[PDB]
């Protein structure tokens, strides 16, 4: 169906700065929301929304990505449980990057309101986000 | 306390009016009449139940004409139906005096709409227990209206009333789906008599008489007249052939 072409969506966006990552991925966002909304527990593929994490990571600062997480938390995000999967994706590249991005990692935790706002606790990973901040204060 | 149904202006605790509901019941006790709206005009049809052989054929006019292009047909009490036409004739005559050119179809509905409603506001007079179906060719396109005892009306692409109102209105939905783009005025004449015979199953215990009057700009050119000659007999054999 429409999920087979997800790899061919953006050819140029990998090489260039890709300022259209917000606008171009919007066409793949609002369309898949109407087929799921809050009804089905798991319907749409949650890896499509996680592609935004793989778009701009090392080539762009972490402040622009945190601003997109605020809009996804207020909106549906193609699934009500889509936020459950996005939490494990944000914590994947933090340990694989390091370098000079360790100073910006402190501001990412305080900027994201998902780990700050209480929920039904679908994942243990978001509870360890504040645990990593404790280890930073120890150093 | 009892008495909600004694007077007119008294409102029921459920939000209805008994004098209005009982007036609608008197509509289904009379002779049935239908109508068909076309692109260039409208077509009226009525089935008059013949009591005995003493009735002289075609001497009873069921469809009364107001001004020229405005036809009127009613199903219900005879004096209540003739009073609306006689009142509507004075409204069309008083309009042309000051306003020159004749009143259109959608504007004429406001004359009877406020007149019938004035009877339900006062207990001195009673509403009309007859359903009047009026229409014709106005200045722009055409319109058709059916006056209810409550005074409520809208634009009707088709109209059904009387004893056979249940089976006649069901056939009007088939005519709309048959010709969704448009319907000629000559074809609707034969289709009007066909629906009457399909609704005659309830009235089949007595004798019937077919009376059809149509108005459009294709032939009469803004004139509302009855059907005479071989045109009336042609619609009878065409409608009875499918039976």
């Amino acid at each position: 169906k429409d999920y087979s072409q997800i790899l061919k969506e953006e050819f140029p966006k990998i090489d260039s700065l890709a300022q259209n990552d917000c606008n171009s991925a919007l066409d793949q966002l609002l369309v898949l929301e109407k087929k799921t909304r809050q009804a089905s527990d798991l319907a749409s593929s949650k890896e499509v929304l996680a592609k935004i994490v793989d778009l701009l990571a090392s080539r762009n600062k972490w402040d622009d990505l945190n601003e997109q997480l605020t809009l996804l938390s207020k909106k549906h995000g193609q699934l009500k449980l889509s936020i459950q999967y996005m939490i494990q994706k944000v914590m994947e590249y933090l340990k694989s990057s390091k370098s000079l991005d360790l100073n910006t990692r402190i501001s990412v935790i305080e900027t994201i309101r998902v780990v700050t706002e209480n929920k039904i606790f679908v994942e243990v990973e978001r509870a360890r986000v504040t645990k990593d901040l404790v280890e930073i204060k120890k150093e | 306390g009892t008495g909600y149904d004694l007077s007119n202006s008294v409102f029921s605790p459920d939000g209805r009016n008994f004098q209005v509901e009982y007036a609608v019941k008197a509509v289904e006790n009379g002779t049935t009449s239908i109508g068909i709206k076309c692109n260039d005009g409208v077509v009226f049809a009525v089935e008059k139940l013949i009591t005995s052989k003493l009735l002289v054929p075609q001497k009873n006019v069921k469809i009364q004409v107001v001004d020229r292009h405005i036809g009127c047909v009613y199903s219900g009490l005879i004096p209540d139906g003739r009073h609306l036409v006689n009142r509507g004739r004075e409204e069309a005559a008083s309009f042309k005096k000051l306003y020159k050119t004749p009143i259109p179809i959608p504007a004429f509905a406001d004359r009877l709409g406020q007149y019938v409603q004035a009877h339900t506001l006062y207990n001195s007079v009673r509403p009309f227990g007859v359903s009047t179906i009026f229409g014709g060719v106005d200045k722009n396109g055409a319109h058709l209206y059916m006056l209810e005892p409550s005074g409520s009306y809208w634009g009707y692409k088709g109209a059904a009333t009387g004893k056979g109102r249940q089976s006649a209105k069901a056939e009007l939905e088939k005519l709309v789906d048959h010709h969704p783009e448009g319907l000629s005025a000559r074809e609707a004449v034969k289709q009007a008599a066909k629906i009457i015979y399909l609704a005659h199953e309830d009235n089949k215990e007595k004798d019937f008489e077919l009376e059809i009057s149509w108005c459009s700009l294709s032939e009469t050119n803004g004139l509302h007249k009855f059907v005479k000659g071989d045109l009336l007999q042609e619609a009878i054999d065409f409608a009875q052939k499918e039976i």
Binding site: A39, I120 | D14, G15, Q166, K169, A170, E173, K174, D177
Partner: protein, 262 residues
């Protein structure tokens, strides 16, 4: 099993109301302990008749599978000497034995009202019947695994004391479905009905005025007899609108309750 979650469709907005007061506390009771809220015991079902309020009782019995007890209003009114007060204590006696139990109530217009005592030709049996239903959900006896589902045709005929919190915590209203909710109902009753391959139910949506979930079933039932006279196995879609127009003239009585209904 007969009626399922697919046949109750169109109520989806009101279906999640029961899942929170039934499916949620039974599957994971610890959620209410984390926030600190008390699990709701009684649930009130009111609205116009024919909207599927009874079907909500049959749909849960064919899915959850827990032991349920149907308690009609007129089944416990048997009177010898103080009999109706004893029968009520018999139904709640099985709550402590079998923990996953939910006792229903079927269309109570009588013993749910207030009706204090002046004259009334020795109503003490029904008067004490009201006192028993207000006992088990009040006194120090603690259950928490027993839910009370009470259905009625109108809240005004129920005791205002019973409507107070502490007995019925959440009142789930089942009004008439909207224009988007009616269309799903036509496909439920016509799913097992043989007809032509070309079908449009959007016509009966506008034709439906003030109809309920039950009256839509009568439209498909009456349409079946229209094809019998013409010797047709498949129902003509044009004959479907004939029955809908016929049902519209069947009511003639009330059909609208607004200001005095919660």
């Amino acid at each position: 099993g007969e009626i399922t979650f697919d046949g109750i469709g169109g109520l989806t907005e009101q279906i999640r109301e029961l899942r929170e007061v039934i499916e949620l506390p039974l599957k994971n009771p610890e959620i209410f302990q984390r926030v600190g809220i008390k699990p709701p015991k009684g649930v009130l079902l009111y609205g116009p008749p024919g909207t599927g309020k009874t079907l909500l009782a049959k749909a849960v019995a064919a899915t959850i599978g827990a032991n349920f007890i149907f308690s009609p209003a007129s089944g416990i009114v048997d009177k010898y000497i103080g009999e109706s007060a004893r029968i009520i204590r018999e139904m709640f006696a099985y709550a402590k034995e079998h923990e996953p139990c939910i006792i229903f109530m079927d269309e109570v217009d009588a013993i749910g009202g207030r009706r204090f005592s002046e004259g009334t030709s020795a109503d003490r049996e029904i008067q004490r019947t009201l006192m028993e239903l207000l006992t088990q959900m009040d006194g120090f006896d603690n259950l928490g695994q027993t839910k009370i589902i009470m259905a009625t045709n109108r809240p005004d005929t129920l005791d205002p004391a019973l409507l107070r919190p502490g007995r019925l915590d959440r009142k789930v209203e089942i009004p008439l479905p909207n224009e988007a909710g009616r269309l799903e109902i036509f496909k439920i009753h016509t799913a097992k009905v043989k007809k032509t391959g070309e079908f449009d139910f959007e016509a009966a949506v506008k034709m439906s005025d003030g109809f309920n979930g039950a009256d839509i079933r009568n439209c498909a039932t009456e349409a079946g007899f229209f094809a019998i006279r013409d010797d047709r196995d498949h129902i003509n879609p044009d004959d479907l609108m004939k029955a809908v127009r016929k049902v519209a003239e069947v009511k003639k009585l009330e059909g609208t309750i607004e200001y005095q209904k919660l």
